[PDB]
Design a protein around this ligand. Sequence first.
Ligand SMILES: *[C@@H]1O[C@H](CO)[C@@H](O[C@@H]2O[C@H](CO)[C@@H](O)[C@H](O)[C@H]2NC(C)=O)[C@H](O)[C@H]1NC(C)=O
Ligand SMILES: *[C@@H]1O[C@H](CO)[C@@H](O)[C@H](O)[C@H]1NC(C)=O
Length: 562
Amino acid sequence: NGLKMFLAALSLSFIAKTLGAIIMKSSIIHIERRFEISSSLVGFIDGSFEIGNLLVIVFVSYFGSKLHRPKLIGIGCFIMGIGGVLTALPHFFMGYYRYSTLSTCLISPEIVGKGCLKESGSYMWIYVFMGNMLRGIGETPIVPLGLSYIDDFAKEGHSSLYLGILNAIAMIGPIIGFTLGSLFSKMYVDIGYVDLSTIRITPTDSRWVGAWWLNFLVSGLFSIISSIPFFFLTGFFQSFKSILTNPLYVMFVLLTLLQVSSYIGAFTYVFKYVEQQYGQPSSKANILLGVITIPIFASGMFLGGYIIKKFKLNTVGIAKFSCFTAVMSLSFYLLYFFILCENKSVAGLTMTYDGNNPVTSHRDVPLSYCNSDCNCDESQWEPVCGNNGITYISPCLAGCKSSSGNKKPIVFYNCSCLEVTGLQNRNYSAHLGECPRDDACTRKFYFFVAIQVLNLFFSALGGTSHVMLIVKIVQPELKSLALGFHSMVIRALGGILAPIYFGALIDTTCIKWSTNNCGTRGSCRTYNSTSFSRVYLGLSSMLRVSSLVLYIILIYAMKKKY
Ligand SMILES: *[C@@H]1O[C@H](CO)[C@@H](O[C@@H]2O[C@H](CO)[C@@H](O)[C@H](O)[C@H]2NC(C)=O)[C@H](O)[C@H]1NC(C)=O
Ligand SMILES: *[C@@H]1O[C@H](CO)[C@@H](O)[C@H](O)[C@H]1NC(C)=O
């Protein structure tokens, strides 16, 4: 086996690391309710893993490479597991979680105090922050160091094949993040301690929390086990300055920073896109997309390793091949622009309550007679779809005199608004929920998903290339640093900032906002279909088009150099 042994543990540590990222995300929403921690802190808690990993990555990489490489990664894994267990710990030392609106037509400081009053000098929130961040350090030596081992110790071109195999087997991590994470979400937090016949809260219930303790246990004990095979297996400034003074490398990391930022933004906002533009709430879509996506992405990465090795591509050749994927992954995006639908008809926001006129400003659409008398709470977002094909903000704002009730039929009757002038024979009724989007888009949505899958395959076929190219354009001794600085740049400036600035441009387009407590903009009830599609796709295509321009310069630069 030889190197294959190291490859075997490296695959195992990749599984552990990737499982670690998804498990925290799965429990991030569940953890807030039981812990009774502030949402702000909840974010700050996620910032913890980031600071761990991001803060020490540029050090572990550079310094670690001189030291024994098969042993250090092992420690990194052992740290990952310890952090996970430690994060599970509060449950061992804490107590049992003791803890309409028909809206038809008619004639936080506490939680914070709860979080703080119970502290009694030291609250449990510090344990989660002190522990999770540990996992970040555990992730630090997996990429910049382990890859620096295989790359330096491998066949002439197999490095590509091995790197493809690792990145295709690490996709089993999510696959095991969604089989147990959802399953263990179903299990109560104090399972085994309390008799589960008395717990009233249900997995669908808001009060119910997910079992964060078992969830981190599965991850910590997996990482600790994964670390067992590894054991058996003034210069800094200058290096950082030297890699940064390399013209080809800086262009390449800038290029990758821009592309990844675009891709990360696209990956995180596809679910708002599935829901807003076409109408799939994404509950069904996420499952369907996930089932198709994981095998196809893994096949894409595997083909990437195989093509590189089989064709015996050199640095310029892989640069070109990478660009080829860059052209193939952007030509597909151009097709998204053609796919856009028209806007959803929302009374009081995009159209008048009588349905006669489009509205230019969603600020202060006057009540129409049909809704003027109703003393309605304008803020409430309880959308009901009328038989006229027009959504209404609430049953009250639709003029619905009566509603069906707590019973299953969702129809609301005698709605003053939406009455079709001239056609009084037909009687009104507004089923709950937003109106479905028109069928042209529904047919189009499948095409959108198909092209998406094609783009994901054609961007995973060049996923292996991103790391493979970096090692070749950097000096044969500062390789570990390279995969560390770059791994920082992908995450610090692009992974951390992707949702923050994509979100902002997207946020401006919202027709309506949710007034959450003091905040009047807590959420967006509905994104304008035309504006959101125009900016989200535009931003993604623009960043990607800039990337192509860099590639051309990058490829021209290597061709001139060689
Ligand atoms: C819609 O409104 C009309 C007019 O208010 C309702 O008409 C009366 O409804 C009750 C029960 O049927 C009774 O007062 C009479 O049988 C109806 N005629 C009138 C005008 O008194 C009607 O029930 C409402 N529901 C609909 C039409 O779906
Ligand atoms: C409305 O009309 C339908 C027939 O189109 C009828 O079945 C239903 O009972 C009516 N409901 C009321 C009370 O308007």
